[PDB]
Amino acid sequence: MKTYIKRLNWEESIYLAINKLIAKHGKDNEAYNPDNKPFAVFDWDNTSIIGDVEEALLYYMVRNVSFKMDPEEFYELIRKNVDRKDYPKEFNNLDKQRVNIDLISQDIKRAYEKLYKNLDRFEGGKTLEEVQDTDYYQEFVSKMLYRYRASEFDPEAEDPYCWMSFLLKNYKTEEVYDLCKGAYASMKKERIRVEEFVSPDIKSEAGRISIKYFVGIRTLDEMVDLYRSLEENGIDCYIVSASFIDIVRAFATDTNNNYKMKEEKVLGLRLMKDDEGKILPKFDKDFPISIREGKVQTINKLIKNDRNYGPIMVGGDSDGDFAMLKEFDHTDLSLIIHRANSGLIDDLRQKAREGSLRYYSQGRNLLEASFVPSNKSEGYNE
Numbered sequence: 482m483k484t485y486i487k488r489l490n491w492e493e494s495i496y497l498a499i500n501k502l503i504a505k506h507g508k509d510n511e512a513y514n515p516d517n518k519p520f521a522v523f524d525w526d527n528t529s530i531i532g533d534v535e536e537a538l539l540y541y542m543v544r545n546v547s548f549k550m551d552p553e554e555f556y557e558l559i560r561k562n563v564d565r566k567d568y569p570k571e572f573n574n575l576d577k578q579r580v581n582i583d584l585i586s587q588d589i590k591r592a593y594e595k596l597y598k599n600l601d602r603f604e605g606g607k608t609l610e611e612v613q614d615t616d617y618y619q620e621f622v623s624k625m626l627y628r629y630r631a632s633e634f635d636p637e638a639e640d641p642y643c644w645m646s647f648l649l650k651n652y653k654t655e656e657v658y659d660l661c662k663g664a665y666a667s668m669k670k671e672r673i674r675v676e677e678f679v680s681p682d683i684k685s686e687a688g689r690i691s692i693k694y695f696v697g698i699r700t701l702d703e704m705v706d707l708y709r710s711l712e713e714n715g716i717d718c719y720i721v722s723a724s725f726i727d728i729v730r731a732f733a734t735d736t737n738n739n740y741k742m743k744e745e746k747v748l749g750l751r752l753m754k755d756d757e758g759k760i761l762p763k764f765d766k767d768f769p770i771s772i773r774e775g776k777v778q779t780i781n782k783l784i785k786n787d788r789n790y791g792p793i794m795v796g797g798d799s800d801g802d803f804a805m806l807k808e809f810d811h812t813d814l815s816l817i818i819h820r821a822n823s824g825l826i827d828d829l830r831q832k833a834r835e836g837s838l839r840y841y842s843q844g845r846n847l848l849e850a851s852f853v854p855s856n857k858s859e860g861y862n863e
């Protein structure tokens with residue numbers, strides 16, 4: 482019984498299943514054929530890592546005002562594809578009034594205008610630190626994180642999406658890598674925590690809001706080891722993420738993040754570019770959208786070919802991964818990180834907790850940024 486991965490904090494039964502998988506499908510097996518190479522597929526956020534690359538990047542870009550837009554442009558961007566209906570009651574302002582994108586976008590614009598007027602990086606002469614004590618800075622940060630937590634995409638929009646990657650408008654890909662290189666080095670240093678942000682006592686359209694936001698991102702020793710071990714045994718290890726491809730590639734291929742994956746093995750959401758290669762807040766319809774059933778389309782069209790088979794193992798953590806976790810008969814092992822989330826994914830967790838030989842739950846301790854050797858997670862979880 483040869484072992485191919487380090488034990489670390491894997492749940493025992495998964496640990497055994499992974500070794501059986503690599504012995505069966507890996508280069509050590511007499512049936513191995515390099516002309517019919519096996520592959521596996523994993524989600525990135527909260528699966529391969531603790532945290533979420535877009536969640537972490539949003540926090541960074543907001544705090545550092547890392548945007549390549551003028552105020553009017555910025556106002557139009559943050560409203561793009563957002564449903565105009567009032568936000569759910571749990572997001573009411575401190576005065577118990579309803580809030581919506583019209584009100585919050587005006588407030589953010591007024592704040593951004595002051596940032597644009599004062600910051601060295603824009604039209605002013607002040608450093609970031611020199612504005613961080615200001616009401617407008619406090620307002621921009623709190624209301625931005627609020628708007629990205631509270632908003633829902635308009636079901637009639639061409640792209641069903643109003644999330645953070647649009648904030649990269651006007652960036653070229655190389656500028657995204659540059660941004661991320663610095664963003665992730667800093668975010669990996671952040672104490673893992675849920676932080677609360679409250680907007681200042683000033684006059685505004687939306688009034689005062691407060692928002693809680695998860696701050697933290699960390700690599701996982703078990704996933705670094707697993708991905709490395711798969712490749713070393715002749716099993717390709719692909720990432721299929723709903724995050725913007727430039728962002729996830731920047732993180733996964735970064736030399737400081739341990740995984741050191743090759744960009745061709747990392748797939749995500751595709752945004753269109755103009756002729757100069759500047760990013761546009763618009764999906765590139767030439768590719769499948771890599772979420773839910775779209776992850777299966779991505780595997781079927783962009784990964785599978787005549788020289789491979791799989792996925793022999795799939796890893797995921799949320800409803801977005803449900804389709805790919807159950808789709809393929811070739812999948813021997815469907816690994817589900819045990820988050821405090823529910824819905825479609827609970828169907829597969831039920832199979833796992835009822836003794837499935839395919840679906841397995843792996844526990845984590847979120848605030849400790851670690852796996853735990855159990856199928857159940859421990860401590861605060863999201």
